[PDB]
Each structure stands twice: as C-alpha cells, then as structure tokens.
Amino acid sequence: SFRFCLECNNMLYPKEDKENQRLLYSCRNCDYTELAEDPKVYRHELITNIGETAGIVDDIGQDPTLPRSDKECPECHSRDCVFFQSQQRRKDTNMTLFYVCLNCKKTFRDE
Amino acid sequence: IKLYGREDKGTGRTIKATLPYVKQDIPIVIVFRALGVVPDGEILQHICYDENDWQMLEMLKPCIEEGFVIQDKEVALDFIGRRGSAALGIRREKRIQYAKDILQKELLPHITQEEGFETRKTFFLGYMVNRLLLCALERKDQDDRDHFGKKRLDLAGPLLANLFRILFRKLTREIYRYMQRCIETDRDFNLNLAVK
Amino acid sequence: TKDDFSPESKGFVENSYLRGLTPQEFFFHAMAGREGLIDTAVKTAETGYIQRRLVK
Amino acid sequence: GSPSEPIINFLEEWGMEPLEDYDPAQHTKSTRIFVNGVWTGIHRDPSMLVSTMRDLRRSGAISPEVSIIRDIREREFKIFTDVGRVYRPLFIVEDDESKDNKGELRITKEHIRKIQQGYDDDVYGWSSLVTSGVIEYVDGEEEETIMIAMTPEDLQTNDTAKRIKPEMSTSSHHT
Amino acid sequence: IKQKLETQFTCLFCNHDNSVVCTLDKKNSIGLLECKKCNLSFQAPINSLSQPIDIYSDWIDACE
Amino acid sequence: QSPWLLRLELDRARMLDKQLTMNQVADKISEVFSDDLFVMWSEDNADK
Amino acid sequence: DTNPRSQLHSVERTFDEVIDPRNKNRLQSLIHPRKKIKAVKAWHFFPDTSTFDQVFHSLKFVGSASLSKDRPLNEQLGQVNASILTSLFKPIEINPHNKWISLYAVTDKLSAESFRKSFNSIKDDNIVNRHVIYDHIKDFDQMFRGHKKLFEDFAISFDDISDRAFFVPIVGRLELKKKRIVPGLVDMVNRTNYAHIRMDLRNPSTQETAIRDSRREQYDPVNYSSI
Amino acid sequence: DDTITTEDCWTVISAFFEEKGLVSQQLDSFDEFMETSIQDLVWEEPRLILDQPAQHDNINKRYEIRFGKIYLSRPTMTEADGTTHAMFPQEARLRNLTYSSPVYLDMEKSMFTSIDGNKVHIGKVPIMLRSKFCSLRTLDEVDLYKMKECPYDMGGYFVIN
Amino acid sequence: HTKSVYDNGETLDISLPIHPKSHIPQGKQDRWVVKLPDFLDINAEPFDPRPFEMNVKTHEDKNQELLDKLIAVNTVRWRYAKSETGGIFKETNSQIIQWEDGTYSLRVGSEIFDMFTTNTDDNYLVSEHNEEGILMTESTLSKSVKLVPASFQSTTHQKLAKALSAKQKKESYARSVVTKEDPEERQRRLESQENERYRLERRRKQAE
Ligand SMILES: [Zn+2]
Ligand SMILES: [Zn+2]
Ligand SMILES: [Zn+2]
After folding, report:
1. For A5, phi and psi rounded to 5 degrees?
2. Does domain B1-152 fall into CATH 3.90.1110.10?
C-alpha cells in the first residue's frame, strides 16, 4: 500500500534530504512533501503465499456444487461445514483443504 | 491489451493497449487520461479493488512511470490522434476531434455510442486490466478456449442476415450511383428504374 | 461436487462391457475413444511425410 | 435471441444501482452485474436478486432461453440474452429449505396426467410444463453453477450382472 | 544518440514533397526538422515517447 | 558510501539443503562485485 | 378496470384509506406483507409549496475531489460544518471549450453560524443586513446531466412535529472533479474569479415576490392565485 | 403424491417432440429472419441523401429517399408467356425452379429546397420449406398428398434450381 | 506551500432575495435522494376528479393501457379536504412507514414499496439562481434511496410482470401482400419507355 498526494492525487515518490538525512515522499507535479514513517522503501517476495487463503467470500455457503463435510468448527462448533482446496493454482500448489463454517465462516485446516 | 515484458526480462512490465484505426500500441495510462481521468489515484481506483494487494500495485508501477510524461486530457487526445492513421499533417484541433471520434466510437462499441457516456468505458477498461493482471499473477487459470459455453452457433437466420446486409449495401450503392448519373438530366426518375 | 478426486470422478470405468457402462463412464470412454481416433488421423500424415523424405 | 431492455428494467426495479453511483473504496463487497457482456451496475445482495430473476424466468415473465449465471467465487452475476446459445431442458428439484417438498422433483403425476389428457382442469403441452416452473433450459455456461442428478432415483439415499452406481462418499450430503 | 530519418512530410516554404529529414537527439532531448531543398531548420523539445510525427505536428503548429 | 540499505532474506531450509555457507555466498558476491559493495551477513544461529 | 369510472373510484378509495399517524392502534394493525413486522411511526407525504419556484440540482464530487479526502481543505474549513452548509458556487464560462466552477465559503465559524441561523429561521418579514464576506477556496471542472422528466429525482425532508414529509424536485445532477490549472493560463485565471465576495441580506422586492408567486400558482392556486 | 418412473420421463420427452420437432431450430431461425431481421437490416441505413448548391441564385437542393416497410408474399412463378401463379415445392423440384418469394420495399422520395414512391421490387428471397412463409405450412394432411408431398418430410431446406 | 493564486481582493456587492420557508428541518439539514421508479409517479398538482375522469385514455395496445392504468393508480397525489369545522386542509394519499427493524417504506394506498438506503458522502443539494448565475446550497444529501416492490404477490409487481412479459411477445414487422403480376414488369416497361424517349431525344438533338 502506497500513498498519494493529498492535493494533486498523484503518486508520491520516496526522496532523501541530504542536509537532514531523512526519508521523504515527494510528488513530482507539485511541491508537496510528507515525512516517511517506515524505512521499508521497497520489498519484493521471491516466494509468496498471498492468494492462498485470501479467496474468501461471506456467501460461499450458498454454492450447491461445493462438498459438505462434518469437520468441527473451532469457533462455532457447528456440525455442518463446507471445504475447498487452495484458490491459488500454481503448478506447485499444495492440496491442503480450507474449511468454512456456515455461521462464523472462519477458514482453517486439518493440519 | 498486451502485457509486455517476460519474466525477469524487458525491464519494466509495461501494458500497451491496441486501439482500432491506430498504427502503434499505446500505454494504458495514456488512454485512461484520454478518456478523461487524469489523476493517478482515480486510475488506481478504477483498476484495482483492494489496496492491500501490493503485487498488482507494483505491477502497475512501471505503467504509471512510463505514462507520467502525459499529464492532461487534451495532450493525451492529441497523442492518440497523431498515431490515428489518418491523413498526414492534420491540425491539432482536427487531430483532437478525430481522437474524440475514434474514442467515443469504435472503442468498445458494444457498451455505448452517445456523448458524455464514457465513464462506463473507463470502468470496463479497469475491469479488463484487472483481469489481465489477475491472470498474469497466476491467481486464476487462463480462460479455456474449448469451453463450449463460450461458443455460438449461426443458423439460417444470422447467415442470411449477413449475406442480405452485404447485398443490400451493394444495391444501395448502385441506386446512389444511378441517382448521381441521372440527376444531370434533371429528370423525374421513376425510382422503379434505379433499383436492380 | 467440486474438488472431487475419487476414481469414479476422473474417468475410472468400474464396470465391464458385459455389465454395461453408466452415463458418466460412457462419456469419459467416448472422450478417450475420440482421442484415439484423432491421434491416428493426425499421425498418419506426419508419418507419410517422414517416409517420403527418407525415401527421397 | 431476446431484447435486453426488460432485463435492465427488472434489475433497476429490484435494487441494482448504476455505475455512476459506484466507488471501489465504498462498495468493497458488492457484486458486479453483467448483461450480454457489458458491465451495467453493481448490487449488494446478489442472492435475493438471483432468486427473483430465476423465479421470474420460471414463471414465464422472462424468456425461458435467457441465461442467468451467478459466479459466487468471482462475485459476478452475468445475464445472457444472446442469439446462438445451445441449451437443453432439465427437471427442477425443489431446493428451498423452508419448503416441505425440499429435495424432490417439482413435477408430479398430476402434470403427467395433464400431459396425457392434453388439457388442464381449469392445450397443455411442453410449453405449459416450461412456464409452470417444473422444467427449465440451461446452457453450457449456466451448467457450471448447478448440481444435477443423473436419475430421479439419485434424489434419495450382490448381483454379478447388474451395473454399479457411483458411491459418492466424498460429500456427507447433497443438495 | 542522434537519429536521422527520411520522412515524407511537405515543406511549407518550398512546397517540395519528400524532402524532409527528421533529426532527433534523445541524449539532449531535441528534434530537428530540415528541408533538403530549403535548408530551413526547425527545433523543438522532445520527450521519451516522441516520434517524428510529434515533431512534425509541433512544426505545423509553429507554422500557424 | 550511500545510506541506501539493500538486504535480502535467505530461506534457511533450502540454504541448508543446498549445503551452502553464508560465508560462501558473501564471498561469491564480493568476488563478482570486488569492493563496490559492503556486505554483512548474519550468523547461522540467527532466527532468520 | 379500464373504465374511467373504475379508475376514479380506485383513486378515491386510495385517498380514503390513508392511516392517521396519531392512530397508534390502526398503525399497529398494519403489518409488513413480507417481514410480518408491525409499524412503529408514520409520516404524511406532501409536496413543498415555498420551494417549487426555485431550481434544485444535486451536486456531487467525483473521485479525488472529495472534500473528506482533501485533508488540508477540511482542516481549514472545519472538521456538520456550517461553512459547508453555507458555501456558494459561481459557474463561469470563458468559452464553450473552457469551463469551471468557483467555490466560496465563510472561514469564520461565528459568522457562518450566525448566517446559517438567520437563513434557517426565516419565517418573519425582518432580515438583518448580514454583510458576509465569502473567500475563494478551490475550483473544479464540471459536467452536467439533465433529467428528461420533471420529477425524475426528489429529495425528502422530514418534520416530526407535524408528522409530514416534504419532497422537492431535482432538475439535474452536477459533478465536480479536481482541475489542475495550466501554468500558462494563470494570467487570465487571476482576471476571472475574485478573492472575496460580499453577500448582503435584503428583503425580496415586491415584483420579484409576485413573479415567484405567479410561478408557484401552477402548483397551489388556493393560497397564491392573483386577484 | 406418487413417484415418477421412467415411463413418465418418456411421456415428457414425447410431449417435447410433439411440440418442437426435430428441425425446429432451422425453421425458427428462418422465421425470425423473415419476420423482423430484413426490416431491421433495411432500417440500419434508412436514408440516401444527395444535396446540390445550384449556382448556374444560391439554390441548395437536397434530394433524399427513405426506405419504408417490407412487404413479403407467398412464392410465385412467372412463366415466359407472362402468367403468374402460386408455386409449390414439387413443381419447383420437377422443373428446376427456385422456391423463392418477392420482397417489396417502400421508398419515399423528398425534395428539400432552401435558397441560401410505392412498393418497389428489390429481389426474391428463397423460402425454407415448412417455414411460416411456405405454401405447405397450411394444407393439412389430405391436401399434402394431392400436392405429391410426403407427410414424413420435415422441411428445413431450400430448393435452388 | 501552494500559495493562493487570488490576491486581488476584488469583491462583489451582490444582494440575494430570499423567501421564508413553509417548514424548517430540526436537528439536521439532511435529505434523502430517491430515484423514481417507472411504476411510481408524482402528481404535484392538486387532484381534480372531473378532469381526471374526462381525460382517461383508452388504447388498443393492451400493454400500454395496463402500464398507464398501473402508473395512474400508483401515482402520488394530493387534494384539498374540507374539514368538518369549515376549514380547508391539505390531504394526501401517500405515507411513509417505519418498521421495527428501522427500515422505511413508501406507501400509496394499500401498496407498499421498500426503501434501500446507501450512504453517500460529499453529496449536497443546491438552489439555482439563474438570473445571477450563482448556485446557493440548500442541504446535504446523505443517503441515496431506491424503491423496491415489497413482494412478488404485490399487485404492482404482478402488473409490471404481465406488461413486460406480453410486451416482448408481439413482434411482427413484415406485412404480407399478394402478387398478381410479374414484379419485373414495371422495370421492363419503364426501360422500354426510357429507350423510346432516348431515341426521340437523340433525333431531336441531331435535328436541333
Ligand atoms: Zn502532484
Ligand atoms: Zn458456525
Ligand atoms: Zn522547403
């Protein structure tokens, strides 16, 4: 998540003040500049796990084509649950199941 | 809407859109500003729907960096018009009008054709870019080409309609040519002779 | 149902020809037979070209 | 092929809100709505909308060949009135939980005897079956989102000659 | 690196066609249009996405 | 020297599987970049 | 029931079956057809007589032009703020191609509060000369969409003491977006708008009031027809 | 109620085939094309406009012709001698004719002038057999034998030459 | 620091005429913008039974007539009601009902239409002053409200469904006709006449 100029709406780029030795975010079409809070200017993940469990919707229990199991919900302890494998579909994706209850909709595994 | 740049190749992964009656590909930020959405925050709102998805944001960063040169609607329209494969030497005002013509019409015609109705086109461009990035990030399988629910069958109706449209356009052109030829005499043509 | 890796859900015909095939097994077996027909009708031309080049 | 104007009118009447009233930050959970491939609006309660559209199609108000698809995973609700889509008829199983007839075929012997007679008891043919909500057409894209039984015997839970039915033990229960 | 390209544009002073050559220097961000017959030189700034059509349009606007 | 810090985290599991040493990686980087980059590496007993 | 007599009879039947808001028992008798839930409170639905002469437009900010998004603007104008509730808009068009909107507001909270109280309490014929000065804040690009039908949109206002609900027509919708002024046109920009605007409150003239009454005579002729 | 058996499924399928038939898609598509598609194809470009600023006294004359309704007829045969009569598919097959019907279009001509037309025949469209515009859609069972047409014939094809 | 562009200080001494309001909002200057459905109409004019009865229109098209009947019976109206004490009062046929869940519904006669509210920010209502070319704000439009029929069994919904279902059933553009002669006869006879007058014109021009 990156921020934008509050008066120009354009993207703010990181900058360093030579005299102050501080990190700043400065727009390019305007003189607006704001102090940087975090030092993590850039991050790149070679191996990532996002998109595995993020694929959750509140009304996934209304799908009739999804199998229904009897795994115990940690939160609601309901007798009815719906499970599915990982939404991320890379060639080396694990086959672990994600179980969703009909009340709390918490995603969990059998591991 | 092509996504240039291979894995760890081609420097930035720029996105260039292809428009009808335009000779060269155009970066997506430029066409977005051409439709009339100049700030970058609004463009990101149009494309993405989850600010926490930093992966698609970092994929979009090179496109914004490339398109940063253009910062106004009229200049973007002029850039689109310059490559519009029209007559050479067209004036700037006529170039902008030609760009407006080629942007309102012939660009996603199935959505709309009337004026002041281009927000939907911007939203559909956002949807297309979202789908392209989503498949590029391997989050979804590429659309199946053999999926029989995405096919259509042309029965006698559509086939005869296409053929009749062609033949009727030919007949209309013949009537037009005969009218031009026969007005020179300034005669009251029966209009039953113009048709063939 | 979605995400079903059971043998009968991915094309294992449990029955025999004498016993008869259920509709799902019938469709899967038809898919396999179509693949066989296509493979024959396609490889024949490639093999013919190869043999002609060898003879020449 | 059918005109899409009645579909848009029904969608607007039943709470769909157009694109100019849409902000991605605000409606972070709303469902998009496509009609013949164009994004026309958004909706916040897609379940009641799809139920209403399906009931309207079954009652004959909408043309029975109109395709109504809900993609819950992708948060989309697509509608097709295009020309050239291959469909096929299917029986309809009463899937309403609140109904006593849950999990049973809607068609009964009364419909069969009406068909055999040829008239209703205050012409009764195939179209009457389709518009009375016991049979409906589905195309190749709507089939992605339905669960079909092979035979009416499948709707309820040692011979060397008869064939073997699938066990289907992966699912504790089916709807 | 200066890039010299022959273009099919029309000079507005000599009226000879196919006698226009576009010289753009990306290092200094400049583009020069020279008439092979009139020997007139037109200079205009260029950007990273500039093309000979851009400099030609700039020359047309400057002419009018 | 520049204030810009460039760091990267190595997967301990695969690093052990490939039977590699942090010193070896640092030496390879130093050899390919001479003295143009100052490099520090965490010990093998670090959590990451 | 295509008979005109049947339609008229349906009209009077609908008129006669209006539930008295004070009747608690009859209100509780009414039940939602689907929710099966009793009614709590009711309001009469009436049009507004004093406001039909005026023209109402729904004004909205699109995208980054949101006042909430503009943090320095909100801080300057106050974090409902009476300054927003008393803002002025000035549409100026140099040419068909070039158009924008000018926004003005009262920076002082006390002056804005006094002006808002005076404006919202106009029920008598004595208005104090409130020479309020409005300061320019920002300019936005504008687009307009018109309603084909008169009452395509209507805004509903409530009045609990009278148990009524007054609705007013909406003529069109105006959208505003943030506009970055070109550096080459600031010379003409400084000659277009103004740093301040002074508003003086005066009682409406007799002729203008008569014109407005004549305009309103289309809706309500019992209390406004000329004699 | 009572359970539904396989025989009831076959009763339903029999009802389906009693209403639809086996070539219903061809006939339905052709009926849709003839009923509405031709008119819309014509109205896609409903105006031909010519203008002329005559100075030969500035007289700007605009000559515009508009396309109106589409009129269709039953297939008809016009002999060499001149007589015209209704045509049935068997005669077309035997005589190597084409089973087609004339199409008539209304053209309205306007002469706009500022100083500053009936059913014309445009062609013959072949008719799909047993469709709504075929002569065999009527005629019941008995007359189908007098016309030397097989009652088992299902239509859905054209007769060209 | 984006310096203020305008520093001339020029000021206009414009005075606006304002009229007293028949009502004043209490506690909040909030209003709800509501889109008008096709099956619901607003009749601001006072109800006049005699012109209404004398102006009822009958059409051959059943769908159009049914739609007009539905919109007329569902139209919001008002009329002057003579009080039993001799006074005159404004009487309306429309009411707003709030249920126990807090939802709101628009009621016309026995018909009930639910309201779906979506919160909208930075949306305000203004008053247009065309003679002075300035816009004066009125209040804030906090929520956008959609009107939805309560249930399937509602008569309005059933009438709408009937009208829309039978509207798309009628589709027949081409009109049949009977050909009595050769369709090509006009062309050939007119070509013969044109060739005849061509020959006559050529002879005249050669003799002229
Ligand atoms: Zn900026
Ligand atoms: Zn639970
Ligand atoms: Zn020259």
Report:
1. -60, 140
2. yes
Which of D45, D54, D73 to probe the A interface (max A CBs under 10 A)? Answer: D73
Which chain G positions have a beta carbon within 8 Å of B45's beta carbon? 63
Question: Whose atoms come closest to the Cα of A82: which ligand?
Answer: 2
Residue with tokens 């301990």: F12
Closest chain I residue to B193, measured at CA: I187
Listed by start position, the domains of chain A span: 1-44, 45-111
Q: To the nearest whole angstrom, how far is the Cα of A68 from the nearest Cα of chain D?
A: 5
* Ligand 3 center–CA B94 separation, angstroms: 24
Topology of A1-44 in CATH? Answer: N-terminal domain of TfIIb (2.20.25)
What 3-state DSSP class applies to I14?
Answer: strand
Coil, helix or strand for G54?
A: coil
CA–CA distance, I165 with D76 (Å, rounded to integer): 26
CB atoms within 10 A of CB D118: 11
User: CB of I164 within 8 Å of any CB in chain B?
Assistant: no
Q: Touching check for A65 and chain C: CB below 8 Å?
A: yes
Give the helix ranges, DSSP H, for chain I.
49-54, 62-74, 155-167, 185-207
For domain A45-111, which architecture applies? Single Sheet (2.20)
Q: What span, in angstroms and rounded, lies between the C-alpha atoms of D130 and D108?
A: 14
Residues of chain D with Cβ-Cβ distance to A100 below 8 Å are none
Task: Tell me how close the Cα of G171 comes to any Cα of chain B, in angstroms.
Answer: 18
Out of 1.10.4160.10, 3.60.20.20, 2.20.25.190, 3.30.70.100, the CATH code matching E1-64 is: 2.20.25.190
Helices (H), G121-189: 186-189
Closest residue in C to D148 (Cα) is C1
The annotation status of E14 as a binding-site residue, yes or no, is: yes
Contact residues, chain G to chain B, C-beta under 8 Å = 63-64, 143, 145, 178, 180, 182
Q: Do domains A1-44 and A45-111 have the same CATH topology?
A: yes
**How far are the Cα atoms of I26, I39, I95, I97, I146 from residue I104, in angstroms, in the given order?**
19, 19, 11, 6, 11
Closest residue in G to I124 (Cα–Cα): G59
Contact state of D141 with B46 under an 8 Å Cβ cutoff: no
Dihedral sign (CA G2, G3, G4, G9): negative
Kindly identify which residue of chain B lies nearest to residue I186, measuring between CA atoms: B192
B15 bridge partner residues: B3
Distance CA I104, CA I116 (A): 8
In the 8-state DSSP scheme, what is residue A66?
A: S
Question: What's the Rg (C-alpha) of chain C?
Answer: 18
Nearest of I18, I128, I16 to residue G58 by alpha carbon: I128
Which of B41, B53, B140 is the closest to A9 by Cβ? B41
Query: Is H44's Cβ below 8 Å from some Cβ in B?
Result: yes
The answer to whether B and G touch (≥3 CB pairs < 8 Å) is yes
Q: Residue G189: which residues within 8 A CB-CB, separation 6 or more?
A: G181, I5
Q: How was this structure determined?
A: cryo-EM
In this structure, how many other beta carbons lie within 10 angstroms of the beta carbon of residue D19? 16
Inform me whether the C-beta atom of residue H63 falls under 8 Å from chain B C-beta atoms.
yes
Residue-wise DSSP of chain D: ---SHHHHHHHHHTT-EEGGG--TTT-SS-EEEEETTEEEEEES-HHHHHHHHHHHHHTTSS-TT-EEEEETTTTEEEEE--SS--EEEEE-EE--TTSTTTTEES--HHHHHHHHHTS------HHHHHHTTSEEEEETTGGGG----SSGGGG----SSS-------S-SB--
**Any idea where the domains of chain E sit in the sequence?**
1-64
Q: Do A47 and F11 touch (CB under 8 A)?
A: yes
Which H/E stretch holds residue G40? strand G39-47
Measured from the Cβ of residue G60, the count of other Cβ atoms closer than 10 Å reads 20
Runs of H (alpha helix) within G17-172: 24-29, 71-77, 82-85, 109-120
